[PDB]
Every structure is written in structure tokens, then in C-alpha cells.
């Protein structure tokens, strides 16, 4: 039985940055969410629509896996119909979203002594962000009436800032590994099914 490669998702060596979230395609395999639910190794497990108890006997067409690591207090900004800096400039979810969001504490992996200048996030955007949109542009954001000319200065700010992860931070200011699964059904025959 070709089990879906969930292990390489949850237990990957490194995860993606907030602004540049990696998308993985899941198809032509069989999954088992009962073990995922009963593991109880995730701090946060909430979602709407489909139920974890009845998720086993459900057939879909494509499953999307997304990876990004944010702070503890931001996990509530990955809910449908939510507004925040993440939901406006980094990662927006549609109102009619279906799927589930998984979050667990990860202090022991991404926190280093003296600071961790490896993870970043989008600071400013010219406008709002379309749902399921990704932006990699590093152009200097402009919040005034003068052209930036590609050089940092007055009213010309870098759109990206680095986190300051450190093992001495607070409970809600600690790294959190978050993966969200998207389930879609199309007019094509279903391929992803349960055991």
C-alpha cells in the first residue's frame, strides 16, 4: 500500500519561511488521519467542515500540504475570516476554506543562543493579499510620496524583517511549526482515498 508521504512533511529537516511557504502535491496514495489525531503531539488541532473522526472514509482528488513557522500568538491568524498582519501580508485563507491546520511547539529546533536570524516575514504590502497568493518580491516598500529609487532611506523600508528566535523568549513568542492541509474535489475521478 502506497501510503501518502506525510512523514516527510511533519518530520522534515527544515521548514519554509513565513513569506515563502512551500506547497506539496499529494495524490495517488492512501492516508490515515486516525494516527495523526491520536498522536496528541500537536499543541493546536482545530478546523471546520470535515470532522477528524469521519475523515478516514472520505475520498478526494488532490491534497495540498503547506509549511511555515511563526510565533505562538500568531496561530489564531490562520483561521477562516481572520484579519491580521499575517492574514493581510503573508498568508491569507479563503472564507470558504476546507481542511485542517496543525500546530505544535518547536522551541527545541529553531531557537539558538544569541538569536536566530534565519526566519523572516513580510512587513508591508502596497495593497491587501488575495487568498492563496504568494509573494517573493523584495522591492523597497514605499509609504510616502517620493520614489524610493531602490535605495533605503526616509519613508523607504525593507518589506522583510527577521525574527529574533531565542530559547529565552516567552510562551507566545516561541517558534511554532504549522502545516495546513487543503482538500479539493473536482469533476475528475477521486484518487486520494482512505484505508
Amino acid at each position, epitope marked *: 500500500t502506497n501510503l501518502c508521504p506525510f512523514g516527510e512533511v511533519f518530520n522534515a529537516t527544515r521548514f519554509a519561511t513565513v513569506y515563502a511557504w512551500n506547497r506539496k502535491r499529494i495524490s495517488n496514495c492512501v492516508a490515515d488521519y486516525s494516527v495523526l489525531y491520536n498522536s496528541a503531539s500537536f499543541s493546536t488541532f482545530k478546523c471546520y467542515g470535515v470532522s477528524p473522526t469521519k475523515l478516514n472514509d472520505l475520498c478526494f482528488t488532490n491534497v495540498y500540504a503547506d509549511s511555515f513557522v511563526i510565533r*505562538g*500568538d*500568531e*496561530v*489564531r*491568524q490562520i483561521a477562516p475570516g*481572520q*484579519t*491580521g*498582519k499575517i492574514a493581510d501580508y503573508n498568508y491569507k485563507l479563503p472564507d470558504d476554506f476546507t481542511g485542517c491546520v496543525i500546530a505544535w511547539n518547536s522551541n527545541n529546533l529553531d531557537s539558538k543562543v544569541g*538569536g536566530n*536570524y534565519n526566519y523572516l516575514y513580510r*512587513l508591508f504590502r502596497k495593497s491587501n493579499l488575495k487568498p492563496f497568493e504568494r509573494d517573493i518580491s523584495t522591492e523597497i516598500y514605499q*509609504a*510616502g510620496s517620493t520614489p524610493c529609487n531602490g535605495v533605503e532611506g*526616509f*519613508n523607504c*523600508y525593507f518589506p522583510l*524583517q*527577521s*525574527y*529574533g*528566535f*531565542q530559547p*529565552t*523568549n*516567552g*510562551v*507566545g*513568542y516561541q517558534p511554532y511549526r504549522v502545516v495546513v492541509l487543503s482538500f479539493e474535489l473536482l469533476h475528475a475521478p477521486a484518487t486520494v482515498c482512505g484505508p
Partner: antibody
Amino acid sequence: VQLKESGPGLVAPSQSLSITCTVSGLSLIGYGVNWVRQPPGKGLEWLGMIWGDGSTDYNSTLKSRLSISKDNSKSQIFLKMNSLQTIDDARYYCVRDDDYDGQFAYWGQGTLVTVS
Amino acid sequence: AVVTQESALTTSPGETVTLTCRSSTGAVTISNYVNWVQEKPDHLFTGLIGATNSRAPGVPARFSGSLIGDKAALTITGAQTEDEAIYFCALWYSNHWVFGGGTKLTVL
């Protein structure tokens, strides 16, 4: 968003203190609440902290006396003190945080507590 | 931990002023998570900047903060007649938030 708290005002020394902070048109859920006090004629003074998940982080020199609890359903934050000192008079605020990586954003009007 | 701020600065409308927040425990880093709050008469408080640069969408664009050297600073561009206040910087040191002494700002 508005924040309101009720304080006894005048309490005898070496007596318990209980301050409740209420929220209007909002929900506690995963939002932290900080307690900050300011004695008259001086600057601000940190007291404690409660996180969204229920964990707490108190002032080092006041952990023996302080105690913070909150109720999600009734939407209130509680502050408890014991063995009050004459110096322990100030204006007490309950401070909330917004969803733009900025803490100490929403404040209250401030309740005044005097001990004598 | 001990943090210090300037006592007071004089400002006229039109130009820019930088208000710093210095920590005596060492050089301020990104991990300090400096926040800024505002004082208004009748004891009115308002938060402006979190994470040292995360401006709120409702806060006017004239308020901006960053790190310069070993001290975190707040920059106001084009001060108005409504910008008189007292500003406090909050730092995350050890396991308890640390407030500053306050900086009174006067507009001419």
C-alpha cells in the same frame, strides 16, 4: 474595543485586593492581558502577565503575593494581591494586544487604589 | 535591567525628530522586541509600534521606529500640533517586561 475595570479604591493595610477587568465587544481567546500600575508622581511599573493559553509570567519581586486568573466564557481578567503595603498604591490598568505584532496596544481607563 | 530615555525635547511642526531608548544591560537587539506607547492628558494610553517596526494600520504613517546602533529609536516625520505626549519604551529582558522613564514631547 473598550476595557473597563472596577476597584475598591480604599483598602486597609495587610488586606486582600481583588481587581476585575472586563472586555466589551471582543473575546479573550488567544489574546494576552498585561497588568501595569503607576504610582502617583512616578513612571510606569510592570506587575505581571497572562498568555492566551493560560500560562503566566509574574514580576520577580511580587511572585509571592500576585495571582492572575481569567475566564474565557465570562470574558474577564482577575488580579489578586495579599499583604498590601502602604507603598502599594497606584493606578491599575489592564492592557490588551492587537493582531499586528504589537503588544501594549489597547488600554483601560485606569482604576485608582489607595491603602491607608 | 535599567533603561533610560531623554527627559524632554523641543519640536516645531514640519521637521523630523528621533526619540531613542537606551538599555544599560548592553546593545539592544531584534530579540528585545521594543514596543512604544503614548501618553495623553486625562491618563489616556495608546500603543503605536510593536516588534520595533510593526506599525498598526490605524496609526498615522508619521510614526516609524527602528534600531540605530545600540539604542532603539522612534522617528516622527512632520510633527503636528496634536503630537504632544509622553512616550514609553518596553523591552523584553530576562522574563519580565521593562518600562522606560518616559519622554515628554512639546510642539511649538
